[PDB]
Amino acid sequence: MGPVIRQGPVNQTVAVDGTFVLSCVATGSPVPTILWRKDGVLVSTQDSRIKQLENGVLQIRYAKLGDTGRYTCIASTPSGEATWSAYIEVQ
């Protein structure tokens, strides 16, 4: 009763070496678990360039060409899921 993403990530063109963000703000009951996937695979933390900040913001520094793709916010709850994705083009 039950997860809504109120702000999700936004489609972007980003420059190589730059820094960009994936934001996700979710409500629900109970509090939803948030996870991020890129082209269907769960995003790394082992990558020093990719950091979890506060207020829903996942931040990616030193953009590479291979960061291009689809990034999905999945908000979960034993009773439901929501998803909100964006396409990031690094060039």
Partner: antibody, heavy 122, light 108 residues
Framework: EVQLVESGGGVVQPGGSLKLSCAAS????????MSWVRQTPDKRLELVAT????????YYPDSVKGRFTSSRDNAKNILYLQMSSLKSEDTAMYYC???????????????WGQGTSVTVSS | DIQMTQSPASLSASVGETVTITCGAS??????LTWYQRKQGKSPQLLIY???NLADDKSSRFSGSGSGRQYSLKISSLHPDDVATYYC?????????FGSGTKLEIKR
Amino acid sequence: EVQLVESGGGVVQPGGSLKLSCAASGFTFSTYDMSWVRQTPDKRLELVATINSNGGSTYYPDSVKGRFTSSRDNAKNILYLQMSSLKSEDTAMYYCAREALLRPPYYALDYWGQGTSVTVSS
Amino acid sequence: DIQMTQSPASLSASVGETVTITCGASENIYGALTWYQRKQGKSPQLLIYGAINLADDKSSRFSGSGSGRQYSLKISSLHPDDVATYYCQNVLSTPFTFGSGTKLEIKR
């Protein structure tokens, strides 16, 4: 104590080239990302170069991309900024700064040098 | 590019006053903001990061607030040594643009 010492500033002709240095000491330099920030005469500030601990990753904003290149020597503990095709807008004070490690890991600069002045002129 | 606009350009208050400096972003930056203090003859120092986290090594007189596009640095119980130029910086996405500064002066 952390010490960051800029040198290499001075006058340079429009279209000319300069290399700045930053002699770092009192912290484990090879282990920290490093930035160069400049302060123009109106007192505005602008980040113009970041470089990671190992030197493998570098960033430059649009204003100086192509024209500015950063490097570091992790044995001697010196940071560099090579500048070229200089113009009046690059006329500024140039600071070398250490990137903090924070929790959460926001980007921030926790120690800065005193600066070296670059004047673009004939 | 995100445009930071800072306010006021300059400001003065008396010892013991509480003062507020503001930073407006051109879009939501989700607390991904930092504040710096620069004293005459010194290098800048970090005061606040992430909009609200005071740096390990500064005074609890400093406090940072806000969300969305609008942010505040509060300096309670002003001291003479607070005299400085204050800067905000966007650190959400590049270019990491700074605010243009607030010079704080003391009335005596």
